[PDB]
């Protein structure tokens, strides 16, 4: 119902485990928000990404350790 094509459940029956890890894929309800927004914000050229995470900040972490600033007072 609702879904017929694309995305499969994976494994359903099991009694004797051998690998322990490997049911079908990753995430069940978080895949919608993750895929939609994480791929929506992507504007760089690549298409085939294997490892996520490389850069985050440069001016925020380097300016705080190089030049200390006071807050409130």
């Amino acid at each position: 119902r609702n879904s017929s094509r694309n995305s499969t459940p994976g494994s359903s029956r099991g009694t004797s485990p051998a690998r322990m890890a490997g049911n079908g894929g990753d995430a069940a309800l978080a895949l919608l928000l993750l895929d939609r927004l994480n791929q929506l914000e992507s504007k760089m050229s690549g298409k085939g990404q294997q490892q996520q995470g490389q850069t985050v900040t440069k001016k925020s972490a380097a300016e705080a350790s190089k030049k200390p600033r006071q807050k409130r007072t």
């Binding site: 995430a27 978080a30 914000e41 985050v56 380097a62 350790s65």
Partner: protein, 96 residues
Amino acid sequence: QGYKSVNITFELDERIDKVLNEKCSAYTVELGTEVNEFACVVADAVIKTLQPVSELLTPLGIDLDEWSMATYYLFDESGEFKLASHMYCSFYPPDE
């Protein structure tokens, strides 16, 4: 020249754990990154990429309003400031 990148766990446990651990858990440090800016940087990445949705995140089970207003502390063992391969980003002190 080289960057030291590591994986962090910010509140993640049984929800969005592997999702953000594989997508936004590898940050660059040792090139001038601290712990306070580390908590604010992880909070900013998750709040910048995941927050623009809200539609699925609010019925999902999380509030998403305590991740942008409330900050977490980063520790490695018991409660010390050190840089390791896997750091723990969670709340430990009392709330005022």
